[PDB]
Amino acid sequence: GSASQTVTIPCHHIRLGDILILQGRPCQVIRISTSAATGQHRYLGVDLFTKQLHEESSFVSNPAPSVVVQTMLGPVFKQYRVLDMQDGSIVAMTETGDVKQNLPVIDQSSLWNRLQKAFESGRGSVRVLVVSDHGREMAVDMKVVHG
Amino acid sequence: GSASQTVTIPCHHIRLGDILILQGRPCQVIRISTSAATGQHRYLGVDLFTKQLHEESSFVSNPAPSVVVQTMLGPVFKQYRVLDMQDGSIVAMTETGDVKQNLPVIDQSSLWNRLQKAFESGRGSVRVLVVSDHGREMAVDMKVVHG
């Protein structure tokens, strides 16, 4: 019925490589420039799912006198337990016990190999970070949790 | 009666050099580490006013199932017009016309020299970014506004 949950990120806390919502799409930022006519920052990113390039400029708000803030939207990452691994997909489990049988892992920064070495040395401590896009979920990062 | 306005920053959007509120103080982060017992990030920064070192660990929240977020607090910067400059202090003006006669400029990254060359080539386009601390205000960055 909607996209997902988003968080507001100030523009001075956005660097190359960050994941931003560019025109409703989760994108990895690959170029940051500044509009000369407006002063907004314009962000060029790669869609994590379609590998397509999207552009979006920042939003300027004026919430109080002498307070001008430029923001973008970021995705809210979910943490899923990894129960098993087998060809590209993993078997994940949410915090409430909901089981995902065929969760795909993004081919980015050789994440599947880092996820496989951590899984075979501590199964209960491996998490994946998941981005939801209009029902499509994908693991984009990992995180080892010591308890 | 209070500190100032703060914004919540996700920890994965915090890099060395950022300005964070460490134990109520505006600090510039100079080291980022991770606690092995808790997984929180602990942040070492330099107080912008006292030049003292402070430490603080991140806050972990669980706002929805399978959503674990680590955050810190950042300062809300104000934009002030620069009307004049003379020995270290500048004459600033807020967006509503409130005049600050002796606003100090931080000695960081040679900001006074960058602020002086921009002032003498476009007075109406120079802004300072100001951090408030318990009444004490200080310009910590500049920004040229084309209109």
From Swiss-Prot, chains A, B:
UniProt subcellular location: Cell septum
Phenotype when the gene is knocked out: Impairs plugging of septal pores and leads to the loss of cytoplasm in hyphae severed by lightly drawing a scalpel blade.
Major location category of this protein: other
Swiss-Prot/TrEMBL GO biological process terms: positive regulation of translational elongation; positive regulation of translational termination; translational elongation
Annotated Gene Ontology cellular component terms: cell septum; Woronin body
MF terms (GO), sorted A to Z: ribosome binding; RNA binding; translation elongation factor activity
Annotated phenotype, changing residue 13 to G: Abolishes the ability to self-assemble
Consequence of changing residue 101 to A: Abolishes the ability to self-assemble
Role according to the record: Major component of Woronin bodies, fungal-specific organelles that occlude septal pores in order to separate intact from damaged compartments. Hex-1 binds directly or indirectly to the Woronin body tether that in turn is anchored at the rim of the septal pore.
Quaternary structure note: Forms oligomers. Self-assembles into hexagonal rods.
Protein family: Belongs to the eIF-5A family. Hex1 subfamily.
Protein name, per record: Woronin body major protein
